[PDB]
Amino acid sequence: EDENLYEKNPDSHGYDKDPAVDIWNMRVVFF
Amino acid sequence: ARQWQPDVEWAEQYGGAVMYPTKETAHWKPPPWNDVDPPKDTLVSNLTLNFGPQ
Amino acid sequence: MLKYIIPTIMLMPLTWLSKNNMIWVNSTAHSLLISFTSLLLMNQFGDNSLNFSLLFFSDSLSTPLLILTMWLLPLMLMASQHHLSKENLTRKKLFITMLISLQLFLIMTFTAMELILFYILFEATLVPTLIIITRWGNQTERLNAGLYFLFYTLAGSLPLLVALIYIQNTVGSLNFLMLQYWVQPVHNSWSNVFMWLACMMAFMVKMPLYGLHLWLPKAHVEAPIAGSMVLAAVLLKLGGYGMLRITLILNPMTDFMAYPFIMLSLWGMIMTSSICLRQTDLKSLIAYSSVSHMALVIVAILIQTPWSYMGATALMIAHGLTSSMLFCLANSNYERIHSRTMILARGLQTLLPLMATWWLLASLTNLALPPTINLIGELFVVMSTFSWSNITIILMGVNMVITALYSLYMLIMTQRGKYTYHINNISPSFTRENALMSLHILPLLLLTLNPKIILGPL
Amino acid sequence: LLDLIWLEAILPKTISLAQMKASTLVTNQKGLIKLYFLSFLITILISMILFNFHE
Amino acid sequence: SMVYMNIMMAFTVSLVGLLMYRSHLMSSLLCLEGMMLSLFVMAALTILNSHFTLASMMPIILLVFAACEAALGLSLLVMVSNTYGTDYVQNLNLLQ
Amino acid sequence: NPIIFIIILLTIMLGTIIVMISSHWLLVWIGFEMNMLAIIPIMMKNHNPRATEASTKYFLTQSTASMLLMMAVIINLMFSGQWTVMKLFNPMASMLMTMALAMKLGMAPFHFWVPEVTQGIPLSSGLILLTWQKLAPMSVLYQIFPSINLNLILTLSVLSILIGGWGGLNQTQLRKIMAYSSIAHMGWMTAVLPYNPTMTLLNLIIYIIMTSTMFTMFMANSTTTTLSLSHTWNKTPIMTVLILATLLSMGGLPPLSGFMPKWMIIQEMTKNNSIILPTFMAITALLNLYFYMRLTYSTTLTMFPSTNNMKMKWQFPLMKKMTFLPTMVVLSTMMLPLTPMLSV
Amino acid sequence: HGSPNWLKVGLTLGTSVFLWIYLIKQHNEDVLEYKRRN
Amino acid sequence: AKTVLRQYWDIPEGTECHRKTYATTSIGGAAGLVVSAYSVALKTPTSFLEGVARTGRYTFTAAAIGAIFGLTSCISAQVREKPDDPLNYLIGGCAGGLILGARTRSYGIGAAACAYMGLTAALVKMGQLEGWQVFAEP
Amino acid sequence: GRATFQFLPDEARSLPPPKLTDPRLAFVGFLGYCSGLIDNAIRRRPVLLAGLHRQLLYITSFVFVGYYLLKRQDYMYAVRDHDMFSYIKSHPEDFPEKDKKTYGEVFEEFHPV
Amino acid sequence: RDHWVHVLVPMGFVFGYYLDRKNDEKLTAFRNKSLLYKRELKPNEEVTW
Amino acid sequence: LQYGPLAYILGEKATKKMTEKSKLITVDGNICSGKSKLAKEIAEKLGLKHFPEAGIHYVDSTTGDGKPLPVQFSGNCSLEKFYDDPKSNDGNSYRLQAWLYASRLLQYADALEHLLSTGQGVVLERSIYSDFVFLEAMYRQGFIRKQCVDHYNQVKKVTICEYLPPHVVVYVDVPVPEVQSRIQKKGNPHEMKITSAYLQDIENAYKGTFLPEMSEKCEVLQYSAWEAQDAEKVVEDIEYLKYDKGPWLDQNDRNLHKLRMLVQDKLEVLNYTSIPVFLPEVTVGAHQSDQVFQEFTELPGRKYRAGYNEDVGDKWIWL
């Protein structure tokens, strides 16, 4: 049928994808 | 689900007899899914000779 | 290019070679590292000229244009991840590899050393774009638009081969642009019309006239995941620049029949921007802005004699950065409200305050506020075609009038309120949503300090 | 009223032009092995009369 | 001389309207075997007055295939009547 | 049955060698006589009443196309009596020659030899064997070449792609879609044959490769275009990616290697100040691509895999010489600076 | 365990060493056949 | 044959407006026979006196086109300024095409018969004007 | 052009030969290196690093054959120019010597905008 | 392990820069020019070739 | 059973194993009558490898090792769910019959595969011919529609071409509908109250429908009583063994017959029953829809990647 997720923001902060090493995705794009 | 429109009607509009594009004409025939043997008519009532008062 | 193609092909057996969800961070890491090396040997000097190595490069000497081609693979992967992350990793590895495979041929294009190396690479695209159009869109009118993207580009480009092979065995060989010192002129005949016309018309089909623009609001309207090849298709349109390589030489003295290309593309300019103020699809609103002030270069190339090439080069990468970001403004704010109807997204400017600046500093580059890269581009075109005939200030001035009322109509539709609905639209424009919206204006206003890097020969 | 009509009238006429003539060439090739060979003979005679072919 | 015009007029026993039409297909296979002797004779008149001494083995070999050819074609024409009983060239099922 | 199936199959290619190994018009008569004798069993094997009513439509079309050839020999027997395979010394002979042989290769006239046979033979398996009969008469037009009228060989070839193109947009049966665009790829090579008759064979060797690899892909189940939908998510999704690559290669797009012939063949067609001749044909094979797009819009976009049937088992057919076909039929465009100096 | 056929496994490893040594000897000869002729 | 063109392209050249359209209706008149012969062969049997092909009007159409096709030129060749030009011979395209527009009614055929015929009209005399040669040899 | 029906004739001795580490011979078989990976991918292998003995002998095939193929490609251009230069050498009436004239002779168009 | 997936792949730069130098060492035609561009007497225009 | 051309020219497999031990036998029966009370009991003396009847998990009962994967991936209409006989549904109750037919066909395609490989007789439970007897009372009870009845009726003339018939086919001792007590006393909680319209109609459909194969040349051995119970046990053991060679065949119809000479009845059935993916190859569904036998494009088209973990279980390097 149809299954789509929401605001990848489970109170946690989140940058790109998920909790951990996706946290390192900011310091590889910002730096 | 959501991704695009892969609808049912795209199979029947491409539904294989003749692919009538811009008109409808004297179509052929819903061609056989198996190998092609509709016309099975082979029979005869064999010869009725009387070797009688010959 | 000594080896810029040789590292960027080595990006390709890195993606599938990787682990699980690390495939996003592994690709974007190394792809930024070329931006030092791209700058590195290039931007050298500089006075007639830099032939680079061999039959594979004239280094894109007087038209740089190529550093912008290398931002994008580390600009689109951070943009495409919004609604892509529901498919299989086996197809997520595909969509990164064909995107790199689009950057490979563009790198040997724009430099290309020849005119027949150009064409086979001019046509080496349109296969990896078409895969991004047909698969990975939304609901239908993908498939006819997948065919309108062909059959204009391919119907025109085949009479190039008839004319380019015709030159290769007429006057020496075309293999170098620097064996183009011996050039016989092209007079007025009945066969030399068609030699000019077939060699020109295949470039008109990509950077459109007012006619034959019928494929441009088809591929951009129905469009991949988050503008993911739509950022590429705006570079590819301005990557039909090669009229600057051809028509400067190689029939130099035919202005006799420029006039049906002038008036069609100078009156069409004042109308095809006027025909957009009643748009109701938001991504089709931008798609006609890309028609109008791209077609100002077509009256800037055919009119020769620089103070136009000062500006016609600066306009190719004027909205290379502007119209990219406007698509990124619309590839965002669609993840939250699932329609591209411009009516529906009201009640805004209170809910998302930090991106109000990203609307304006986009739309302040079409108003163009003279110390940018934009009104250093138009005001050389204006002062050029003034010297063609004085009357052309009228149509080009009303071009400046209507696009002022046009750009603000997209801003001012968000300055309303009370929102009436929308228990969704919560996400307060996360760290990725501002990062890929940045790196657009951060080089755009930076280069306004010393824009001698953005100039032709000239 | 113009941009979706009289630019869209002339070139997608060609889509509906060829498919009008892509139907006259399967639906008139409807079998008729009697009528293959009556039409080979017209082709073999018209090569004699027409042009360069005997010259 | 006139011994070649007749017979080159007699080569038009193909004539293609009567090389596959009309029905009773045996009437069409008839002139396929009868198109020979317009080649077997038209060769034999030329090799024989002009003493070639060697090419006259070719009219002997001209029959040997065309007999074996037409015999093969006659095998299949039983198979169209083995399934029906009548040949009738206005049988057509597999369109084109 | 098994051993005699080779001896029938072996002599098919032995029939066509004598066509090439000959200095004498009698032996080239025998050469593709016995091919027309040794194809008729391969048409039959499972004895279905379309196949018997298809080979007999195949048969007499290649009996007359045989028979006019022997008529063309005996005419220039009368004129100068030489029987070497060379120029034919008579315009009434060569005219009767070329448009007799145009039936075996079938051109645009002599029309329905190509769809009416190849459709509905229950042996769709192959019927790759219809590449020899495109190969035997091309080996005859290499010698006869400096004696033609130059109008007939183009008028059969200008009509070739204009009517082999239009004929199949109105189709579903993918054997006919392979039967069509097989007249078209006989249109590109005999439009060139008067001008430098090599760089014709370049088009032919490419045409054997790209067509042979198309049928081997088809031998999983595929019959009709609707059946070409239902194997992406069922049989192998790598098959869908492969069947995309060859079609887009066989359309002539310059990232692949079906653009290898044209690119070279216009290097010969102009250089002979003939420009309006290629510009017609080069724009004609464009709607020869609208077969292939709108075929690739079936399998590569997940168009309705319904009627849940699971193939939970592996595949064991014989895909012979398949691993090396889409590695020389796609990726060769850089690697051929001179294929036309090996074949020349 | 491992269970191949153990028959042809090595024929592929034995054909190349036949092919390469036939190639290199044909190459190392023909590298000198230039100067032997020219 | 080719000698018809060797009496078409040779003598008149704009003037002598009767023999121009007397010869230029022979060629276009002859091609009505060719479209008649396949329309009785590739199409099935018509009425009792074949060729009676289905709608008729075939050779009725084709010779009428070549009847005016010199006449629209040779009038307008001399009356304006007395050469033969690509803009001269352009005029015979549209109204020459409109015979097929007049019959089998217009508004979708006739202007499309007008437009495309005007494209292929002027290029012919343009062909020898630049010396174009279709079927050539080195 | 004589000495008919050879793969490559005797007279190809004085040609270089085309020795290895040329990028074509690296590329010939690179596609074969790609081809052996396909050979697993057709059959639901499901390895993509499968049996190396199938993944080898593709490399051996193309490189050997492609080398033995290229010895006549460089021959055929060498026999092409060899016959052209001879016909250039005879018949000087078909090959005149053009005059050397500098830019003091030409008065070209002159067309300014 | 030692991650050849990572930074070993940007080390193809110098691998590509090795092939970058091999062309100009056979493109050594002219030491004879007149626009500085001299190669007159000195070990300056000989070096870096 | 042949193995390619090369093995076939050395040793053939038509008749050096089938030394009259073909004896391809099946049963027909009714419910709770001929299940295994008589069928499974006779394997020895005559050496007949019994095959089970049916079930959703027959494809799960092959290709391995081997444990049955659940009804999510093999989504059928769920034995003991369709006993609610949903005359108005989404549904579908016909979608059982598709998987009922394809689990039926692979047993008979392994039947002929086993014989020429080995030479053993095989009892079947219900052949491919029994599937139409259900359709008689599937029709008159209102839980089926037309334009689904015609579908497998069109498959029947497509998929059944090469199948040699069974031999001493037994209609088992079947009562006068005492199955209403047999369906109750023998347990079966979900086989329930549904009245004589499903009881009597299939019983009337064993006689008038199965008669032409019963009147085909392979002689039948019919009983109609309570059970065999040493009255029709040995009588269908000994006097059917006399009907295995002597009173056995009339038009002979099944012998791996007169083309057993390395010809079309010797390999071309034993090469087309090997590798049973070409046997359900024409088991492809409708034109497009058929409104019951469907699966959506991506949901449940995304129920395939869950059933595609690595897509082949185990094969390793170096081999």
PDB file of N, CA and C in Angstrom, chain H residues 2 7-8 20 23 29 31 37-38 40 42 44-46 51 55 62 75 80 92 111 120 124 129 132 136:
ATOM      1  N   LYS H   2      14.218   9.740 -67.811  1.00  0.00           N
ATOM      2  CA  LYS H   2      15.040  10.908 -67.510  1.00  0.00           C
ATOM      3  C   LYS H   2      14.996  11.935 -68.628  1.00  0.00           C
ATOM      4  N   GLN H   7      13.473  17.348 -71.330  1.00  0.00           N
ATOM      5  CA  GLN H   7      12.631  18.309 -72.028  1.00  0.00           C
ATOM      6  C   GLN H   7      11.884  19.215 -71.065  1.00  0.00           C
ATOM      7  N   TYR H   8      11.891  18.886 -69.773  1.00  0.00           N
ATOM      8  CA  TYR H   8      11.357  19.784 -68.762  1.00  0.00           C
ATOM      9  C   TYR H   8      12.394  20.817 -68.342  1.00  0.00           C
ATOM     10  N   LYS H  20       5.097  24.171 -70.659  1.00  0.00           N
ATOM     11  CA  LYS H  20       5.608  23.941 -69.316  1.00  0.00           C
ATOM     12  C   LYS H  20       4.651  23.062 -68.524  1.00  0.00           C
ATOM     13  N   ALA H  23       3.966  19.358 -70.068  1.00  0.00           N
ATOM     14  CA  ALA H  23       4.916  18.302 -69.746  1.00  0.00           C
ATOM     15  C   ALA H  23       4.933  17.996 -68.252  1.00  0.00           C
ATOM     16  N   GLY H  29       0.990  12.973 -63.547  1.00  0.00           N
ATOM     17  CA  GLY H  29      -0.110  12.162 -64.013  1.00  0.00           C
ATOM     18  C   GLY H  29       0.261  10.696 -64.039  1.00  0.00           C
ATOM     19  N   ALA H  31       2.357   9.117 -62.050  1.00  0.00           N
ATOM     20  CA  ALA H  31       2.448   8.552 -60.710  1.00  0.00           C
ATOM     21  C   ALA H  31       1.088   8.235 -60.110  1.00  0.00           C
ATOM     22  N   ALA H  37      -1.955   0.993 -58.982  1.00  0.00           N
ATOM     23  CA  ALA H  37      -1.649  -0.416 -59.201  1.00  0.00           C
ATOM     24  C   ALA H  37      -1.451  -1.170 -57.895  1.00  0.00           C
ATOM     25  N   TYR H  38      -0.911  -0.516 -56.869  1.00  0.00           N
ATOM     26  CA  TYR H  38      -0.816  -1.187 -55.580  1.00  0.00           C
ATOM     27  C   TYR H  38      -2.129  -1.125 -54.825  1.00  0.00           C
ATOM     28  N   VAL H  40      -4.948  -1.732 -56.077  1.00  0.00           N
ATOM     29  CA  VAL H  40      -5.765  -2.865 -56.496  1.00  0.00           C
ATOM     30  C   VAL H  40      -5.066  -4.184 -56.171  1.00  0.00           C
ATOM     31  N   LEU H  42      -2.279  -4.576 -53.426  1.00  0.00           N
ATOM     32  CA  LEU H  42      -2.083  -4.719 -51.989  1.00  0.00           C
ATOM     33  C   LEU H  42      -3.404  -4.626 -51.245  1.00  0.00           C
ATOM     34  N   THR H  44      -7.481  -5.609 -51.481  1.00  0.00           N
ATOM     35  CA  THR H  44      -8.220  -6.747 -52.012  1.00  0.00           C
ATOM     36  C   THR H  44      -9.046  -6.374 -53.235  1.00  0.00           C
ATOM     37  N   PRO H  45      -9.781  -7.331 -53.804  1.00  0.00           N
ATOM     38  CA  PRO H  45     -10.461  -7.084 -55.080  1.00  0.00           C
ATOM     39  C   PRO H  45     -11.597  -6.083 -54.956  1.00  0.00           C
ATOM     40  N   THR H  46     -11.600  -5.133 -55.875  1.00  0.00           N
ATOM     41  CA  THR H  46     -12.613  -4.098 -55.963  1.00  0.00           C
ATOM     42  C   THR H  46     -13.734  -4.569 -56.889  1.00  0.00           C
ATOM     43  N   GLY H  51      -8.770  -1.764 -62.393  1.00  0.00           N
ATOM     44  CA  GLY H  51      -8.779  -1.144 -61.072  1.00  0.00           C
ATOM     45  C   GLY H  51      -9.868  -0.160 -60.680  1.00  0.00           C
ATOM     46  N   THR H  55     -11.923   4.045 -52.682  1.00  0.00           N
ATOM     47  CA  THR H  55     -12.509   5.378 -52.743  1.00  0.00           C
ATOM     48  C   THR H  55     -12.379   5.996 -54.125  1.00  0.00           C
ATOM     49  N   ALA H  62      -4.024  13.045 -59.094  1.00  0.00           N
ATOM     50  CA  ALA H  62      -2.588  13.226 -59.284  1.00  0.00           C
ATOM     51  C   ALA H  62      -2.275  14.066 -60.513  1.00  0.00           C
ATOM     52  N   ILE H  75       3.243  31.430 -65.016  1.00  0.00           N
ATOM     53  CA  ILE H  75       2.589  32.728 -64.937  1.00  0.00           C
ATOM     54  C   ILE H  75       3.492  33.632 -64.119  1.00  0.00           C
ATOM     55  N   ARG H  80       6.539  39.032 -62.839  1.00  0.00           N
ATOM     56  CA  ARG H  80       7.096  39.894 -61.807  1.00  0.00           C
ATOM     57  C   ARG H  80       8.327  40.651 -62.288  1.00  0.00           C
ATOM     58  N   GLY H  92       4.280  27.818 -56.368  1.00  0.00           N
ATOM     59  CA  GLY H  92       3.619  26.623 -56.861  1.00  0.00           C
ATOM     60  C   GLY H  92       3.470  25.528 -55.828  1.00  0.00           C
ATOM     61  N   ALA H 111      -4.131  22.835 -45.146  1.00  0.00           N
ATOM     62  CA  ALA H 111      -3.028  23.731 -44.811  1.00  0.00           C
ATOM     63  C   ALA H 111      -1.748  22.943 -44.564  1.00  0.00           C
ATOM     64  N   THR H 120       9.110  21.461 -49.806  1.00  0.00           N
ATOM     65  CA  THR H 120       9.775  20.634 -50.804  1.00  0.00           C
ATOM     66  C   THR H 120       9.685  21.211 -52.206  1.00  0.00           C
ATOM     67  N   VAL H 124      13.933  22.026 -55.017  1.00  0.00           N
ATOM     68  CA  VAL H 124      14.221  21.297 -56.246  1.00  0.00           C
ATOM     69  C   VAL H 124      15.002  22.187 -57.201  1.00  0.00           C
ATOM     70  N   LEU H 129      20.452  24.961 -58.762  1.00  0.00           N
ATOM     71  CA  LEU H 129      20.953  26.321 -58.614  1.00  0.00           C
ATOM     72  C   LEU H 129      22.278  26.324 -57.867  1.00  0.00           C
ATOM     73  N   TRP H 132      23.291  20.572 -57.005  1.00  0.00           N
ATOM     74  CA  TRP H 132      23.172  19.427 -56.118  1.00  0.00           C
ATOM     75  C   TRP H 132      22.968  18.157 -56.924  1.00  0.00           C
ATOM     76  N   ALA H 136      25.422  10.186 -56.848  1.00  0.00           N
ATOM     77  CA  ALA H 136      26.664  10.577 -57.502  1.00  0.00           C
ATOM     78  C   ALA H 136      27.686   9.452 -57.413  1.00  0.00           C
TER      79      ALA H 136
END
